[PDB]
Structure formats: structure tokens, C-alpha cells
């Protein structure tokens with residue numbers, strides 16, 4: 097209209113322990129997220145890792161916390177939960193799963209996940225009596 | 239344009255959204271399940287959905303269930319053209335059994351915007367700056 | 375609106391679409407793998423892809439494999455500029471070995487629309 101600009105990923109540090117999120121290349125899908133504390137995760141266990149950052153996502157997306165590739169392939173690390181709502185203003189947490197047979201050590205400053213700005217719709221929901229058939233139909237689960 | 243649903247029995251609950259800017263609509267169990275430690279279950283919602291054009295439906299984990307109970311969501315891709323019963327694949331990685339009762343909120347449904355590209359084979363692709371190096 | 379791919383060996387299979395409005399293209403194993411219980415494997419497809427601009431490629435789980443065999447997909451983020459071999463990280467949480475045969479459908483690839491905002495540090499979020 098009057099103003100012509102690009103939306104930014106806004107963040108604020110909640111402590112001196114946080115690291116500003118980084119992007120490897122100009123077209124990496126995600127911003128790197130860093131642990132603010134030390135964690136020791138035993139075999140077949142989980143931990144909630146605090147980043148000590150609050151974020152304000154641009155309109156029309158949510159923030160998906162996604163796994164690092166190397167951590168999954170080499171160490172059997174996975175990311176649980178992962179849905180950061182557009183209107184969340186709290187401390188960003190990463191839920192890490194250790195499926196390996198050895199303990200996994202997280203140190204303050206380690207890169208442990210990535211944040212992706214996934215574009216979504218926010219549709220209104222409408223109940224109907226019945227839906228119409230497609231070629232796929234009710235065919236599911238292999 | 240909208241997310242349309244229909245109930246497949248009286249045991250279903252209409253999906254809900256806590257906020258106008260919440261990513262997902264909450265999905266509810268229509269039945270009772272006990273999931274033992276290190277086991278999986280397929281949870282019926284007893285709804286069929288018609289997703290808006292230009293997206294798929296991602297069944298995504300609730301945060302509390304993940305962080306406290308070590309519950310995860312398997313599979314999770316609901317195609318735009320799917321008209322069957324929406325199932326939730328729950329993985330229990332915790333050491334105690336996880337109880338699901340009718341009416342419990344067990345997952346969320348996100349309308350993820352996607353492309354539907356046409357596929358083309360070529361001999362070889364040109365390299366960028368990331369190269370072939372992955373899994374770092 | 376165009377997804378380009380090339381084969382890195384004779385063992386690769388061209389990605390297919392399961393239905394007209396399927397979210398993903400089927401990805402196929404190029405090799406034979408035995409995954410023991412509670413273990414992982416990196417399954418090579420022997421393809422390289424060029425994603426359309428404005429998306430990343432998400433490697434996503436097959437539903438039958440999850441529901442029946444307790445198979446899951448780890449990692450899964452393919453960056454727009456990646457031109458290497460597409461690897462699938464398969465997790466076997468089941469109690470029996472899982473056998474992957476050359477030519478088996480093991481995952482799907484979804485073109486997830488994203489954007490690339492610049493990052494801005496503020497002191498308070500309402501600055």
C-alpha cells in the first residue's frame with residue numbers, strides 16, 4: 097500500500113547463555129538452533145533443551161524444529177514435538193530423543209536442531225453431512 | 239478454501255483450535271487404547287476430511303505428550319485426495335503404558351502448503367556451492 | 375513447478391506419484407539392506423534432485439511401513455541447493471529385522487513451501 101518491505105525473523109535473548117540463530121548458506125531451509133545449557137541424555141531417553149531465545153515469526157507461517165542430518169545418521173538423535181506457533185512468545189525448547197545405545201552429551205553452544213519457516217493455511221473449519229469421493233477414496237496404509 | 243469434515247460415527251469430536259494463530263487443529267481419539275512401553279497403535283478419529291486445495295494435512299505431535307510422556311507421531315501424511323478415516327499412528331517410547339480414552343486430544347493437524355511439480359529426468363545436474371556433501 | 379532428477383547409477387528407480395493429488399513422490403532403495411531391531415540405516419536412492427524455488431524437500435515416512443512394521447524416517451531436510459545423492463535415514467523400532475530390497479518403496483519426497491526471512495535481533499519483541 098504505502099510501505100514496501102520484507103518480513104524478518106525477529107528474536108530476543110532471554111539470557112547471556114543464548115546464541116543468535118545462524119544460516120549456513122543463502123538457501124539453507126533452516127536457521128541453526130543452539131543449546132543454552134549442558135545436558136546428558138542417557139540411552140533411550142529424552143530431554144527438553146532450552147535455547148533461551150524468544151521469537152516472533154513472520155505472518156503466515158509456523159516454525160518447525162527439525163533434526164540435524166549428521167546427528168540422526170551418526171548418533172541416532174531425533175527431534176520430538178517441534179511445532180512453534182506464530183503467536184508463541186516464550187522460551188523456544190527443543191525436545192531431543194536419544195535412541196542410541198550410548199549416552200549423548202549436549203554442551204552450551206552446540207548446534208542441536210534447525211528452525212524452518214513453513215508456509216501454512218489457517219482455514220475455517222466447516223462440518224458437513226458427508227464428503228465426495230475421489231479416485232484415491234478411502235485407500236490408506238499401504 | 240476451508241477445511242471440511244464429516245463424522246463417521248457419534249464417537250468423533252470436531253477438531254478445535256485454541257487460537258486464531260495456532261498452527262494446528264487438535265485431533266481427538268474416538269476409541270480407547272492402552273499402548274505398552276515401546277509399542278505402537280493406530281488411533282481412529284472417526285472423521286473424514288477434505289483439505290483446502292494446495293496443501294496436505296500433516297498429523298503432528300502435541301508438545302506436552304512428547305516432552306513428558308515420550309510420545310511421538312509416526313507416518314502423518316494425509317493426501318489432499320484422501321477421503322477415508324483419519325488415523326493417528328502413535329509411538330510410545332516411554333517405560334510405562336500410555337492410556338488413550340475417547341475424547342482425549344492426541345495430535346494436531348497442520349495444513350502444510352506444498353507444490354505439485356511435474357517430474358523431469360536429465361542426464362546430470364549442475365552443482366551449486368553446497369555440493370554433494372551432506373550428513374555433517 | 376518442475377522437479378528435475380538424474381540417476382547416479384544403474385540401480386536407481388525414477389520417483390513416481392501414487393495418486394493425482396498425492397503430497398509426495400515415492401522414493402526407492404537402490405541397494406539391499408538388513409536393519410536389525412532398534413537400529414538405523416542410511417538407505418541410498420542413487421538420485422540427485424533439483425527442487426523448484428521456494429521450497430525444500432522433506433523426506434517423509436510411508437504410512438503402511440509405520441503402522442505395520444514400526445518404521446520411521448529420521449533427518450529428512452533436503453536443502454534447495456543440495457545436488458548430492460539423496461539418502462533416507464530409516465529407523466527400525468520393531469522387534470524383528472527389517473529387510474530393504476533393491477527397488478522397494480521406502481519413503482516419499484514432499485516439496486514443502488517455505489520462505490527465507492532475514493534475521494533481526496531486538497531487545498524487546500515490540501521494539
Ligand SMILES: O=c1ccn([C@H]2C[C@H](O)[C@@H](COP(=O)(O)OP(=O)(O)O)O2)c(=O)[nH]1
Pocket residue numbers: 235236237238297312313314315316317320323324325326327392435436437438439
Ligand atoms: O498418519 C496417517 C498417514 C496416512 N493416512 C492415510 C491418509 C493417506 O492419504 C493414506 C496413505 O495411504 P497409502 O498411499 O496407501 O500409504 P503408503 O504411504 O504406505 O503408500 O493413508 C492416515 O490416515 N494417517
Ligand SMILES: O=c1ccn([C@H]2C[C@H](O)[C@@H](COP(=O)(O)OP(=O)(O)O)O2)c(=O)[nH]1
Pocket residue numbers: 161176177178179180181184187188189190191299300301302303
Ligand atoms: O518442540 C517444541 C514444541 C512446542 N514448543 C512451544 C511452542 C508452542 O507454541 C507451545 C505449545 O504449547 P501447547 O499449546 O500447551 O502444546 P500442546 O497443547 O501441543 O501440549 O510450546 C516448543 O518450545 N518446542
Ligand SMILES: O=c1ccn([C@H]2C[C@H](O)[C@@H](COP(=O)(O)OP(=O)(O)O)O2)c(=O)[nH]1
Pocket residue numbers: 163164165166167371372373374433448449450451452453456459460461462463
Ligand atoms: O534425510 C536426509 C537429510 C539430509 N540429506 C542431505 C541433504 C541436505 O541438504 C544435507 C544436509 O547436510 P548438512 O547441512 O552437512 O547436515 P547437518 O544438519 O548435520 O549440518 O544432507 C539427505 O540426503 N537425506
Ligand SMILES: [Mg+2]
Pocket residue numbers: 214215350351486487
Ligand atoms: Mg510445510
